[PDB]
Scaffold this active site. Structure first.
Site, PDB file in Angstrom:
ATOM      1  N   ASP A 237       0.848  -1.190   0.000  1.00 44.76           N
ATOM      2  CA  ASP A 237       0.000   0.000   0.000  1.00 44.76           C
ATOM      3  C   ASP A 237       0.887   1.244   0.000  1.00 44.76           C
ATOM      4  O   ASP A 237       1.470   1.608   1.028  1.00 44.76           O
ATOM      5  CB  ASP A 237      -0.945  -0.008   1.200  1.00 44.76           C
ATOM      6  CG  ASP A 237      -2.242   0.745   0.930  1.00 44.76           C
ATOM      7  OD1 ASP A 237      -2.437   1.227  -0.207  1.00 44.76           O
ATOM      8  OD2 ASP A 237      -3.070   0.849   1.860  1.00 44.76           O
TER       9      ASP A 237
ATOM     10  N   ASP B 249       1.120   8.590   3.343  1.00 48.23           N
ATOM     11  CA  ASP B 249       0.366   9.467   4.238  1.00 48.23           C
ATOM     12  C   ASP B 249       0.704   9.196   5.705  1.00 48.23           C
ATOM     13  O   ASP B 249       0.556  10.089   6.544  1.00 48.23           O
ATOM     14  CB  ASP B 249      -1.152   9.453   3.941  1.00 48.23           C
ATOM     15  CG  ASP B 249      -1.812   8.105   4.106  1.00 48.23           C
ATOM     16  OD1 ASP B 249      -1.223   7.190   4.722  1.00 48.23           O
ATOM     17  OD2 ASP B 249      -2.956   7.976   3.603  1.00 48.23           O
TER      18      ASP B 249
ATOM     19  N   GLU C  14      -5.680  15.402   9.499  1.00 53.29           N
ATOM     20  CA  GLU C  14      -6.577  14.573   8.717  1.00 53.29           C
ATOM     21  C   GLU C  14      -6.470  13.098   9.097  1.00 53.29           C
ATOM     22  O   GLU C  14      -7.466  12.364   9.021  1.00 53.29           O
ATOM     23  CB  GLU C  14      -6.254  14.767   7.228  1.00 53.29           C
ATOM     24  CG  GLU C  14      -7.311  14.220   6.255  1.00 53.29           C
ATOM     25  CD  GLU C  14      -7.139  12.727   5.973  1.00 53.29           C
ATOM     26  OE1 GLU C  14      -6.035  12.190   6.214  1.00 53.29           O
ATOM     27  OE2 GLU C  14      -8.124  12.074   5.556  1.00 53.29           O
ATOM     28  N   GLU C  15      -5.295  12.660   9.565  1.00 52.66           N
ATOM     29  CA  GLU C  15      -5.005  11.249   9.802  1.00 52.66           C
ATOM     30  C   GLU C  15      -5.312  10.763  11.221  1.00 52.66           C
ATOM     31  O   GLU C  15      -5.217   9.553  11.471  1.00 52.66           O
ATOM     32  CB  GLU C  15      -3.527  10.964   9.504  1.00 52.66           C
ATOM     33  CG  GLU C  15      -3.188  10.892   8.030  1.00 52.66           C
ATOM     34  CD  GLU C  15      -3.763   9.653   7.361  1.00 52.66           C
ATOM     35  OE1 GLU C  15      -3.526   8.520   7.855  1.00 52.66           O
ATOM     36  OE2 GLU C  15      -4.437   9.820   6.322  1.00 52.66           O
TER      37      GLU C  15
ATOM     38  N   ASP D 112      -3.633  18.836   6.665  1.00 49.50           N
ATOM     39  CA  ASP D 112      -3.778  17.624   5.884  1.00 49.50           C
ATOM     40  C   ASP D 112      -2.387  17.292   5.356  1.00 49.50           C
ATOM     41  O   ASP D 112      -1.893  17.999   4.470  1.00 49.50           O
ATOM     42  CB  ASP D 112      -4.769  17.851   4.737  1.00 49.50           C
ATOM     43  CG  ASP D 112      -5.186  16.554   4.029  1.00 49.50           C
ATOM     44  OD1 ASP D 112      -4.563  15.504   4.299  1.00 49.50           O
ATOM     45  OD2 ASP D 112      -6.130  16.598   3.186  1.00 49.50           O
TER      46      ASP D 112
ATOM     47  N   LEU E 257      -1.087  14.883   3.474  1.00 50.36           N
ATOM     48  CA  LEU E 257      -0.937  14.373   2.112  1.00 50.36           C
ATOM     49  C   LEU E 257      -2.321  14.402   1.467  1.00 50.36           C
ATOM     50  O   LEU E 257      -3.055  13.416   1.484  1.00 50.36           O
ATOM     51  CB  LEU E 257      -0.344  12.972   2.090  1.00 50.36           C
ATOM     52  CG  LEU E 257       0.454  12.653   0.825  1.00 50.36           C
ATOM     53  CD1 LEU E 257       1.540  13.712   0.617  1.00 50.36           C
ATOM     54  CD2 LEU E 257       1.052  11.249   0.880  1.00 50.36           C
ATOM     55  N   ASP E 258      -2.644  15.531   0.877  1.00 50.54           N
ATOM     56  CA  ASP E 258      -3.920  15.700   0.212  1.00 50.54           C
ATOM     57  C   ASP E 258      -3.924  15.053  -1.165  1.00 50.54           C
ATOM     58  O   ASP E 258      -2.918  15.059  -1.873  1.00 50.54           O
ATOM     59  CB  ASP E 258      -4.230  17.187   0.092  1.00 50.54           C
ATOM     60  CG  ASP E 258      -5.487  17.448  -0.706  1.00 50.54           C
ATOM     61  OD1 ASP E 258      -6.585  17.125  -0.186  1.00 50.54           O
ATOM     62  OD2 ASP E 258      -5.350  17.972  -1.845  1.00 50.54           O
TER      63      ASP E 258
ATOM     64  N   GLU F  56      -8.664  21.571   5.293  1.00 53.38           N
ATOM     65  CA  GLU F  56      -8.755  21.665   3.839  1.00 53.38           C
ATOM     66  C   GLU F  56      -9.400  22.977   3.406  1.00 53.38           C
ATOM     67  O   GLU F  56      -8.761  23.771   2.708  1.00 53.38           O
ATOM     68  CB  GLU F  56      -9.547  20.471   3.265  1.00 53.38           C
ATOM     69  CG  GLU F  56      -8.857  19.143   3.424  1.00 53.38           C
ATOM     70  CD  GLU F  56      -9.614  17.990   2.768  1.00 53.38           C
ATOM     71  OE1 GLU F  56     -10.848  17.904   2.949  1.00 53.38           O
ATOM     72  OE2 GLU F  56      -8.965  17.172   2.076  1.00 53.38           O
TER      73      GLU F  56
END
Ligand code: 96G
Ligand code: 96G
Ligand code: 96G
Ligand code: 96G
Ligand code: FDP
Ligand code: FDP
Ligand code: FDP
Ligand code: FDP
Lengths: 328, 322, 328, 328
Positions: free
Chosen positions: D61, D67, D90-91, D111, D113-114, D273
């Protein structure tokens, strides 16, 4: 004219000679190891060793990490080339016989990371290699690595100095290549380099003066106190054979690691240190002697055999040989 | 623990000292010059010089100098620059003037450039102390007045050694990150080493004290083994080895260089500052290098430095021969 | 198993096929050009344009400098390979005939910097190429580039995206390679890529909707309002053909640049845009059509001929072709 | 004029404002994480995952590794800055409260890794962040992250596209910086960017058309079939908010991710975001609306709250808002 990279330059020569491609494939693999070694030597990824993402992994024996990694890069790239049958490494007690399914026709002797005492203080270090064709009809063994230097197919070195350079010879002189890190490839920078007939730099570890023979003691005396009225030579000794030999190649002069009382056969290794640089220097019009015979004419007897080494500009080596003759 | 880059490490110290920010801004600009020098030294872009796009046009001393001068002047932190490369001192224009004087060798070890041996960058930073107009006299302070000093070593990897008066710190350039990472805090030189470093090609021009000392390194009077010899030919390379391995580095006076070869302002003082900050000694043979009162910006001085017992033994040879 | 670089992988195939070496040498020169383009695209050396050493030289047109620089890199590297006789570039009105002393047997059609409207906003861009063997016995002329895509010897593209990738086919499927910037070489990361039979992404510029033909209008409407309880497709349109086509290859789906009233022959170029990606997509088990025949079957008539392009997962392209037949 | 790097440019502003230095230290730490992310995104060291030294470690993955690595880089660099008390990622489901001994005054929503669906196909991706001053007197908690976007101290993004760019605003317009990979530092390339009053590009996922509200349906229809003799807009949708928003900034036009039947509150996240890019677009003279109020005026109620997002050139957003009022 045109901008040439090393692998294109080699491909063109291997094609015009209508060879099998096997030497080209071997050399291309060695250069991939050299690029990988250079990138690690320049410390790519060090911030991750010091915990940028939260994982601290500070290195203890950085000469051990680097020479172990270097050795694996060279061994793995060469074996995967399908061009090799026997490898000799400065790092391995025994010869490394390629697995039968990956076997090719060439023997490679190499020092994966020369100048190890210079790793921690960040002075120049290098990789040295010499390539032979297997000539015996038997099974591949360490005896295939015991050819004398006159049988070299190709030899060269990588210098990880202020920039990364490769010197390479296949028997037709010496060519120099510089790694362009923004391109990721070695660019041909000088064709058929020729050493000066006589230099003005002498290069040896004078901390062994009390162990020198009389000829070496005399030769150093002549360099400092010329019998001539000429200016004395300058002295340089980086402490990495590859760095000092390359300076000798491009500036002229002489490099010496003679026998001494404590190292009666010299220190440097015949197979993977002295023979390749002796080959390079002689292809460029220089001389390489043990003090009693040419280095390349020595018949090796063990893969880690030592030999005294005196090389460089022909006139300088000639004066050294005269000192040897004059002192018995 | 935490991973610290050079500029973060300096910012924290300059913040906790509640300073104006001007030293931090000067150092950040110097480090930008050093990164640019390192990239050029490693020959980035060389393929375009050799005609990859069809324009064949097959310098490093000059580029380094311009990189340093431009980054320092644009820092708004400088009033006077002294460079190994410029006959006269360089006075910053009034709209870019700040309070610091910088003495630097942009590319030390120039005879080693073509053989790809180690080269480096050396610098020493002073505060302007005169009330007059900026002039080259502002660069004539003795090394006791150094605000900060250090060097960059472009060797097998790129390193910076830096001191602001509280010891010596070492940083490595991680080329994949583009930043110098702090790798060792407060380095200390060994009391005594086993390497001696000088150009023995001047042996016929040495004074008796140098001659005797070199003889003692080769023929020890105490059954101990002789010292090993190393001489890269780049002061920065040899001094940094002296720092991290111990031993002694020498460029004494000789008949042909009766006041020495190396330059007081931008060669001897910065490395003398570093070596002393690490607990070593740096002498001209008659006084500490940092105590020499400069008289001209390109003044030469003898230099003997390294582990303290080794320098002590050299000084004994000096005195034993008057 | 072994770590293979692109040139090692190509040499091995060229050896087992017992070739002359001329394709391997051509590809090696193309990859050197691509690495040089990738470095310039990532803005290596930008600090010197903005006066780090005192010479301010800000480029007024980024898209003009980079495609001119790209074009020179490819032309110079290919001609210097000694493998080419004719080049067709998106950037040159006429075919470029190699000088007589550098002539080889191959024709190359290429777009050196595709996706030019994405350069200033830093979205993905790329390089596209297709290689043919010269078929005429005569002097080289642009007629050597007017072969249809069924005759491709090798084709591929470089994607300068979040990382740099090359896709390459010589007729045995599609291989993917990634540039390791710390190594400076492309590493084989996926062998024999296969596109999904059917995707869930449709990719076209819907700002031309008022100019679409009825079949395109019907197909797009089916993607948004499916009549079979399945979910509507997602939409993606980067605006760089290489980026959108590569997503199509690895995620599945369909990419369309059909004819429309304002571009009645389509927009994309047959020789150095549509044919190369058509070859790649078919090698991966997909389809590539103009709406009336396969792209690879079109006989070129001029080097800059335009053609409609619909390609991707086979079942999706077929549903589109069904719409085309349904609307006469 | 002079060549300015990002951290120099920020230091000069922080000096003339005579601040404590804490914001400067935070931003410097953030840029180090971004430099580290860019290097990993470009796949530095990939050859070592594929066994160049004999240790194969191919990742399954890729979106999960990158990310997670991104998130760790940001969290560790920010916490180690000693400038933070609260981080929202975000994570991470819960807010991350900085340890007491590293506490500073700033809250960061990011974020790391957008555009994660674009990782495997190598389209552009990015990092987004907004910085607030802790204003409560209490203990640090997630409520310190629930300030509305009007209270932003600094915001920006990194775009990992064909090159790496940072957009940054501290309240006085938008400045753009490019990473020079040969220098390792971000160079200021454009000061105080201003968005066009009206653009010619519209950007949204039209695969949700059957789920659009009437105003969105009408606005999209007007862009394709203008009623006033103007040409229809071109369409672009990279699928990474940072890439699409940045194109909107430098080219003009509109980007929309409105509410729809399947995402009745929108998809994009308010804290890390929508607010950051809304701040950037407004600082450049554009508009950013939810369709009922400006994004920056929404009072957050949960750290992972969603909000509809319509932003870009002011005249284009206003035409969208006119459709919203026209459909009740
Ligand atoms: C007279 O000076 C020289 C200099 C260099 C050489 C050589 C270098 C490499 C070899 S080789 O044996 O490996 N053959 C090949 O590489 N053939 C090839 N076919 C297709 C491709 Br593409 S490369 S011979 C020979 C003579
Ligand atoms: C006792 O050991 C040391 C070591 C280093 C230093 C110094 C380094 C730089 C300076 S400075 O004068 O430039 N001030 C500042 O940089 N202030 C700042 N404000 C905000 C930010 Br962010 S940095 S002081 C002081 C003492
Ligand atoms: C069946 O699938 C394939 C795939 C690829 C190929 C080909 C790639 C390159 C060629 S070539 O024509 O340039 N010749 C050579 O490369 N010769 C060489 N000799 C020694 C060395 Br070392 S390289 S053929 C052929 C068949
Ligand atoms: C008028 O528009 C602006 C734009 C930017 C800012 C700010 C950026 C950073 C800050 S700060 O709070 O971190 N303080 C400092 O950085 N101090 C320092 N002293 C010495 C050094 Br060297 S850095 S303020 C303020 C106003
Ligand atoms: O320290 P001394 O005895 O001079 O040996 C130096 C020689 O040894 C070598 C052998 O590899 O270095 P090192 O022992 O530092 O690895 C050569 O590079 C160098 O020329
Ligand atoms: O050639 P000799 O006289 O030994 O001088 C070497 C010294 O000179 C310096 C002065 O810069 O280098 P170089 O002349 O090679 O540029 C020092 O780096 C080095 O230590
Ligand atoms: O603006 P539209 O007409 O959608 O054009 C998109 C197509 O044109 C191309 C042609 O090269 O881009 P561009 O003109 O922007 O360089 C293709 O990459 C892209 O697929
Ligand atoms: O596939 P759709 O629904 O258009 O979502 C796209 C949006 O989601 C985001 C949210 O991070 O990407 P993703 O889900 O691909 O990670 C935005 O970058 C992008 O604008």
């Amino acid at each position: 004219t045109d901008m040439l990279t090393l692998t294109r330059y080699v491909m063109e020569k291997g094609r015009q000679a209508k060879g099998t491609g096997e030497l080209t494939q071997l050399l291309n693999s060695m250069l991939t190891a050299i690029k990988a070694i250079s990138s690690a030597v320049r410390k790519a990824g060090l911030a991750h060793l010091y915990g940028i993402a939260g994982s601290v992994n500070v290195t203890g024996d950085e000469v051990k990490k680097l020479d172990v990694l270097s050795n694996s890069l060279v061994i793995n790239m060469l074996q995967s080339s399908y061009s090799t049958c026997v490898l000799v490494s400065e790092e391995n007690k025994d010869a490394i016989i390629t697995a039968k399914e990956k076997r090719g026709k060439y023997v490679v002797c190499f020092d994966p990371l020369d100048g190890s005492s210079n790793i921690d203080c960040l002075a120049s270090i290098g990789t040295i290699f010499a390539i032979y064709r297997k000539t015996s009809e038997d099974e591949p063994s360490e005896k295939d690595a015991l050819q004398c230097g006159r049988n070299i197919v190709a030899a060269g070195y990588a210098l990880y100095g202020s920039a990364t350079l490769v010197a390479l010879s296949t028997g037709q002189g010496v060519d120099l290549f510089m790694l362009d890190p923004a391109l990721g490839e070695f660019v041909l920078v000088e064709k058929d380099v020729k050493i000066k007939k006589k230099g003005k730099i002498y290069s040896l570890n004078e901390g062994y003066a009390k162990y020198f023979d009389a000829a070496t003691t005399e030769y150093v005396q002549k360099k400092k106190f010329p019998e001539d009225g000429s200016a004395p030579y300058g002295a340089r000794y980086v402490g990495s054979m590859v760095a000092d030999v390359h300076r000798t190649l491009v500036y002229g002069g002489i490099f010496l690691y003679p026998a001494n009382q404590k190292s009666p056969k010299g220190k440097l290794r015949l197979l993977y240190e002295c023979n390749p640089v002796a080959y390079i220097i002689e292809q460029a019009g220089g001389l390489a002697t043990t003090g009693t015979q040419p280095v390349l004419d020595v018949k090796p007897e063990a893969i880690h055999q030592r030999v005294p080494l005196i090389l460089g500009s022909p006139e300088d080596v000639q004066e050294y040989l005269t000192c040897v003759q004059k002192n018995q």
